[PDB]
Amino acid sequence: ASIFRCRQCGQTISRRDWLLPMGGDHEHVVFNPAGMIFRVWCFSLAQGLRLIGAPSGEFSWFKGYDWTIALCGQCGSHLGWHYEGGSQPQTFFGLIKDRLAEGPA
């Protein structure tokens, strides 16, 4: 249990070693304006995503960061968001925990 893959298709996405404690915890539970709850795991790094459009600050869960939707680059599943335009770190990924599968490298 060291790498994270897209639950829907198996695309390689991230690694346990790349988890990022933002504000003291890599896990943040948040809601969007439609009331959907997301258990977000922050990672310093991810791969195999497709980042959609240009960044927006609207409703951002992380102060100082603008977001872009991150889809699985293979199957198009919404896996989370890429955050940028902030400070220490400038960028990171917030991925929806239950949309990933964890397993051996």
Ligand SMILES: O=C1CC[C@H](N2C(=O)c3ccccc3C2=O)C(=O)N1
């Ligand atoms: O940091 C974030 C990422 C974007 C996220 N987001 C949503 O998941 C969403 C769904 C529908 C309409 C508008 C939004 C919105 O800004 C949100 O609420 N905060």
Ligand SMILES: [Zn+2]
């Ligand atoms: Zn996928």
